[PDB]
Design a binder for this molecule. Sequence first.
Ligand SMILES: O=S(=O)(O)c1ccc2cc(S(=O)(=O)O)ccc2c1
Ligand SMILES: O=S(=O)(O)c1ccc2cc(S(=O)(=O)O)ccc2c1
Ligand SMILES: [Cl-]
Ligand code: NA
Ligand code: NA
Ligand code: NA
Ligand code: NA
Lengths: 242, 242
Amino acid sequence: MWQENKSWNAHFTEHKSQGVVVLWNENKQQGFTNNLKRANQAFLPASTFKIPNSLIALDLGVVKDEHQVFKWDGQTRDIATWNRDHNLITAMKYSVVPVYQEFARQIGEARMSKMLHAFDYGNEDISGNVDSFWLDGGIRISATEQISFLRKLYHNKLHVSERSQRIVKQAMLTEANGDYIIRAKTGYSTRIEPKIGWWVGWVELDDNVWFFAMNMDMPTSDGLGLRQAITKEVLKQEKIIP
Amino acid sequence: MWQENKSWNAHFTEHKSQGVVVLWNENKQQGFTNNLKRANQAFLPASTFKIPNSLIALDLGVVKDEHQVFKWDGQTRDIATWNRDHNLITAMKYSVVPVYQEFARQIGEARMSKMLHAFDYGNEDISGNVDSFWLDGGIRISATEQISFLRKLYHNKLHVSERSQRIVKQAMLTEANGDYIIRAKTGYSTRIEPKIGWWVGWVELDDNVWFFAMNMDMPTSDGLGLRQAITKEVLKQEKIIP
Ligand SMILES: O=S(=O)(O)c1ccc2cc(S(=O)(=O)O)ccc2c1
Ligand SMILES: O=S(=O)(O)c1ccc2cc(S(=O)(=O)O)ccc2c1
Ligand SMILES: [Cl-]
Ligand code: NA
Ligand code: NA
Ligand code: NA
Ligand code: NA
């Protein structure tokens, strides 16, 4: 099932960093990682929680579809792309936290807790603030647990409607060409140590899909590009993407 | 509503050919083209008929989902990519006619003709074989008629389920990066003169979507890549993609 390959550490070493990448080959039901222990250590999901959050908001009707416009509240924040109107596509593309904070407020503590229990998501714990618990509360999830959740989403097996799951899988669209399709979500956990950056999702090939979930030490925002860079180096080494 | 911008013909004559490109700004509700007469000229849809064919087959249960495998029939044909198993995603990417010829045969003439009338698709005529009329039968559709069809598809108001339309819009995925997403379908009509090449779809932006339909004279298969090349040149000139 799980096989360890420490070859991939060089890609983390090359950039003064440490992390874990987890790959799952859907067809052959075989997994791969450079660090079995870290692959199963639970961290704050940060903005990768936007995947379950969107599924919940859509299923409950907080968000009717991917065209509904969530208008900027007018407060100028540090990330410039947040200071504009957004729909679910652009909101997820740019990790617009304010938009998902009002989602969490409408969902409320009870329904959020109930949904995460049914999702089997992480430790299912929403302790902390209603609109910030995935950034500084008690919820935790491992990279392998992200793959378990993601595999349910890919196969439309999560407890919410098939429509909700198809809309989110559309919003996760990051990259696509003649070779592959990447649906994925980035995350950056800055409020509680250890500061880490996430990239979870999958790579759709012609006749297979590879699920991946990576996290890495991230002391500042300047290294965020390595989340995608290091992952793609691993995908190139296994001849998944050219 | 429409306006002619014959500046684009320099992108066609540069590659020794003729054609039309039709754009439609969804937000502004304004259309553009380099030749309004060819824009309204109706040709065989060729494999751009895979868009409505896929909707009909999905709505009728001929195709269960985007993951169902359709086994190669063993007959080795001239396009290598056709001689292997496929699903809806790859069968559309490689324009695998045999796979869609089976779809049509199971849909049948009666339901195909009622569905095309419900879609308002072209001249709604399926005269000829039910398994080849979009390649050598009587169906005819213009570039502007493709845009009307595609607009309904984008808005889920075609007369099939919302599920079927979302799946087809998924299978149309051609290209996606941080700047745009292209959902399109290629076509090469070579059984009845004039031999022409199609590219129809739309470009999803952050705050807008641009529908496009284009066709051009294609005497030999060598020039097929100019379908996308010329379209991207127009889109660049109109400050639609960088
Ligand atoms: O609220 S914080 O400033 O801690 C915060 C929250 C989410 C973030 C997501 C990203 S992401 O672009 O990596 O998704 C980057 C920085 C972030 C900072
Ligand atoms: O059956 S034909 O050989 O006439 C035929 C049908 C569809 C085709 C689609 C393409 S595509 O470029 O639209 O994928 C290219 C050649 C084709 C030939
Ligand atoms: Cl998609
Ligand atoms: Na997105
Ligand atoms: Na944090
Ligand atoms: Na179906
Ligand atoms: Na023709």
